[PDB]
A = this chain, B = another copy of it.
Amino acid sequence: MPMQMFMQVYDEIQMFLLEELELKFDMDPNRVRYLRKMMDTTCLGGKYNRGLTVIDVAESLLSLSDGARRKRVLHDACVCGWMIEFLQAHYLVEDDIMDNPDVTVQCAINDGLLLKSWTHMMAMHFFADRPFLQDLLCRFNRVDYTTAVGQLYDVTSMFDDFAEFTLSNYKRIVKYKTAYYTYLLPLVMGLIVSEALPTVDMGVTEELAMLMGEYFQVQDDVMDCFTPPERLGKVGTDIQDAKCSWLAVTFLAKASSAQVAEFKANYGSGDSEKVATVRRLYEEADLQGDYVAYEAAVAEQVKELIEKLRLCSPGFAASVETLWGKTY
């Protein structure tokens, strides 16, 4: 059911943004319609996992001490959810510019800029009189900066060659690039709108967000290599791109000197046979044995930290449980 509410609030945000351009920024109808279409193309289609997490946190926090406050909290949760979905839309556009007087490139750069600006525009309007507006803006922008920093860690992982191919550096990339905006931010925004931010142990929450991010990334990295092409997914290019993947860092700790030498000579190449040699190396190293156990250990840690969180924040722990269920 929260999906119907989330989509209704999208119509409300879209109409505000588009009317603001038409009425305050001198926008002609042709450009307004172009922006409506661009917003729909970039912001709709996904699973809305980050957005829906905000809704789920707010409704759980109504249980622990209905009226005029309830309606407001749920509406606020939906606007916050769209801020994260538009920020995600902004990141995807920026990633698509990497797919390599070109009007498509000009428009993609511009779309990226507008989608980011729209997160600030919708916040400043819908939360104009809220006392949490300043803290919300500063936490949102710090997470956005964290993601850009995470992107630098990722993009330069193979540059200065395999010195940064460690589990602790893998965890640094995961934390900054994905965990903060995908797991921590939706949870924090749900706490902000509910005015229940100081009532939770931030340490355990951050640790849970980082762990769920790490669980998801290991699974994503494994699927990037072994999940069949357009049969069971999308195009996996981590091997070709020489990414600091969980498979790569685990292989380097389990491989012999000669196998490491063989991995180094075949990794980071577009050549089909070199990619296949890497896949054969992962298979022969019994990394799928290690994958199962790594994930199971992380899962045990997640399940344990939710219990510590439940002792002082019960309603919140059940929303952290449903977010985890979506990952597990």
Contact = CB atoms under 8 A, between A and B. Distances in A.
A109 B100 CA distance: 13
A98 B105 contact: yes
A151 B35 CA distance: 13
Interface stretch (A40-48, A60-68, A155-163, A303-311): A155-163
Given A102-B100, A141-B120, A241-B101, A114 B148 contact: yes
A153 to B, nearest CB: 8
A27 B134 contact: no
A149 B98 contact: no
Interface in A107-130: 107, 109-110, 113-114, 117, 120-121, 124
A113 B148 contact: yes
A97 B100 contact: no
Interface in A6-39: 21, 25-27, 30-31
A176 B106 CA distance: 17
A76 interface: no
A145 B121 contact: yes
A149 B25 contact: yes
- Looking at A25, A105, A137, A155, which has the most chain B CB atoms within 10 Å of its CB? A25
A113 B134 contact: no
A129 to B, nearest CB: 12
A221 interface: no
A126 to B, nearest CB: 14
A144 B31 CA distance: 19
A292 interface: no
Contact of A114 (B27, B152, B153, B156): B152
Contacts of A152: 31, 110, 114
Given A101-B241, A107-B155, A117-B141, 11 more contacts: A26-B172, A27-B149, A97-B105, A98-B109, A100-B105, A103-B156, A110-B148, A110-B152, A113-B151, A124-B141, A137-B137
Interface of A: 21, 25-27, 30-31, 94, 97-98, 100-103, 105-107, 109-110, 113-114, 117, 120-121, 124, 133-134, 137-138, 141, 144-146, 148-149, 151-153, 155-156, 159-160, 172, 176, 240-241
